[PDB]
Design a protein around this nucleic acid. Sequence first.
DNA 1: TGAGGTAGTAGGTTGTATAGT
DNA 2: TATACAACCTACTACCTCAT
Lengths: 474, 419
Amino acid sequence: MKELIYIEEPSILFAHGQKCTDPRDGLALFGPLNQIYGIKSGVVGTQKGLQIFKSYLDKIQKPIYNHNNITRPMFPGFEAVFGCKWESQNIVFKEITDEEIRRYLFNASTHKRTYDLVTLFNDKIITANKNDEERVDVWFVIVPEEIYKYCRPNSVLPNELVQTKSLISDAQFHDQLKARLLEHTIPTQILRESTLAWRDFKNTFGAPIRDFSKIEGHLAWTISTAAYYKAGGKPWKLGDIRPGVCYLGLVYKKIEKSKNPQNACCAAQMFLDNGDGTVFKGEVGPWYNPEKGEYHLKPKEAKALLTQALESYKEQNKSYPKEVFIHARTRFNDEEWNAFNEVTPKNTNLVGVTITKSKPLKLYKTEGAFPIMRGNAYIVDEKKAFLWTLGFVPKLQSTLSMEVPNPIFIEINKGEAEIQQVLKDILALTKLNYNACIYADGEPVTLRFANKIGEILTASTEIKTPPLAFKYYI
Amino acid sequence: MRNKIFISHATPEDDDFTRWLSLKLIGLGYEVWCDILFLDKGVDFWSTIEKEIRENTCKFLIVSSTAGNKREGVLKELAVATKVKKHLQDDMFIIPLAIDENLSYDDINIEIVRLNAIDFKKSWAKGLQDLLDAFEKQNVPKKPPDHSKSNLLYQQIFLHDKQAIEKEETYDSNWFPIISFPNELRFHRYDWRLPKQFDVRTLAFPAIRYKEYLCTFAWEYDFIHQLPKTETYNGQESIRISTSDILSGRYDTDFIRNYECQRLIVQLINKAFELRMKDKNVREYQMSKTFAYWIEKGKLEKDKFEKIKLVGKQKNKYWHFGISAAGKLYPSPVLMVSSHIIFTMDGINLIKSKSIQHSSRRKQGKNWWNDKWREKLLAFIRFLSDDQNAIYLNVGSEEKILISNKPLKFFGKMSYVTP
DNA sequence: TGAGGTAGTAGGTTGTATAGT
DNA sequence: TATACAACCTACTACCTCAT
Ligand SMILES: [Mg+2]
């Protein structure tokens, strides 16, 4: 009968250095880590899109409650929560019209239809951001359903709506929208006309297609927390993080387009204690592997990455971090790490850590309808362990994973360290997701955003964008 | 002397707001008396209230909700402030906190109808500004703000009920440790007897093609009916690799490394399961990855085993608990068992389109809670077991793999009170 | 919340060396 | 240009996310 140790839940710190465990409650009690001058909000949607966007700004000034306000804390009201106004009186609109929508949308190709609406929006965004004397804190892309419906691969607009046959016989609109606005840094928060007005989008039955009465205040939490974070200040910080750590999330995405099926764009995301994050963009190489179904790097690009991060770190923090953990979901090949090894200062400790959500050690609590609470961990070796970032949480009185939770295999594939700190740090890192404002992050923010990021790397490949905070990558 | 800000409220209708008003207030520096913070146990519970509103209560705040004005306990709580509104002879003693977007004049109690609206309706914040700016105009007493007090309470008070507690609790895995492995792993230089074109997963024993040698836990003699003209192989000729070495890493041949051998056992383990399930009373659900094993309807009395219910019904489709076998070597060699929910409109004829199955599985998943997913699995593996302590899997006639039918138990101090 | 989308992982399907003409 | 194999690719399912 093995024994589980338990990891004390890491504390995140909000306004006035007062730290607790639930951002939602941490923000609601004290507000944000750095309170911000009011969000100027700009809109890039249909004349309807504003009224909707205006519906939400007005809506969220008032409190909005979830179904059960224990498992999901209520949303007190934007100003009460964040101590600043995100006003609907103060909107800086760039219109788009159905004529514009119909003209560009109806193309036979999804891609020529997708790529052009995106170019429409950016020009509508870029003309306003670049040209404007007035300043807008976040650009809110209010997508009419008709866009969301058809602007993805595998969605077939009928042959009876296409005005132009395809000129010849990626393609996700929003990620592309972020990827093209990537070179000139602008915060893009993308919303759906349906989400903001979901009770005004009735189905044929007359009930709402998607009915959100259960979680309506939760939405504001996720939206405002992200909007807030985009607008400048980060909601919170990790409360008790030892100084001078560097977390590096390794991201890749296979570029399918290449005839040679090894082109994979590359990246590393640098988190410290904030999760504002810095996305280091690596250039495109042969990272994918056929035999091993794995992602890996040649030394020379890998050194650049490590340096690009160490250096931007020292430029940010005036020293080289005494500990650097590099996360990826894969093991490390000895050459790739020795490449990292050389770049590294002599006394900084480098740690390669493999967070694999395989399907192992599903732990079923013996008594009670609820599962193991999150923070339980099983330590296999001094090197490898099992972490439950998921499972019952008492402050919520709910399971984070709504079924029986899957812990995460955490192996110190390369480097040496104390597995206990690792688990800890990683438990800490689930807490840093500004965009989805929840109690905890299922996957440490290091890797959490890999897959959404992976698109954005591939979606724009001509650019050579500087290292960027997340808000540009979100 | 009087300093507090007594909060009068309906519970649990205005709890979300009162708990936010007090605590934003308390952290701001005020002294707030609220039933929210205490866990009273006296007959003086109401006198405590009364004593506090009587003497030390500088301001009476009342939740002006629909429920607040119609509530016996808050109307009783209101009774004193009007009794003590004169004593103090200050007009702003009572402050209705109009938090309700839908107060008809008629609900509001007459005494507080007259008074001035503190408007939490339009935004919780503007009214907090309005409640304090009103606290500026008349000099209500204040300490320099310590939000630390604020959440000292939150963390100790509101979270008192539910947090991590030094409790003991054991959990049962779904990993099922192999018990006994065949004393050797041998490799047959089958040569002319081997035909590469042939498929052995109809060879009723776990076999695979590695190089030109033959890999299995079945001893060369075991494949006869489907494999003729092999009485021709020297019993010596074949490598006889100590399994009790392989797990350790003791075995490293430069011709094949242990990582190769560890992978190799699995297909077998998993094939041995697959064959075992050909003849252990359960109809099989095929997913591309591997097979899922669900007992048909009626096989267990009233579709229950050993008290559990591993087949049931949802709507017009029966549900039937199913499992899979992943075999993993590391850290300890075990049989992993992921749990499934197969589906059938009738007792034994499987549903055609997974889209329905996907929709049913999720629909059915919602009913089962941690207690439920555990028992059925345990039962189901208790189901299959061919004796008291383990399952059998048949690699060959004299060689068997024995997995424990009960999963590793993990014991952890620290658990949560169940709600 | 949930209708979505992703990430495992096997394999059978498949695209490449070897080998013999 | 036969095939004896190599290494892909493709469903399918359990999770987990967001145009949240
Ligand atoms: Mg999102």
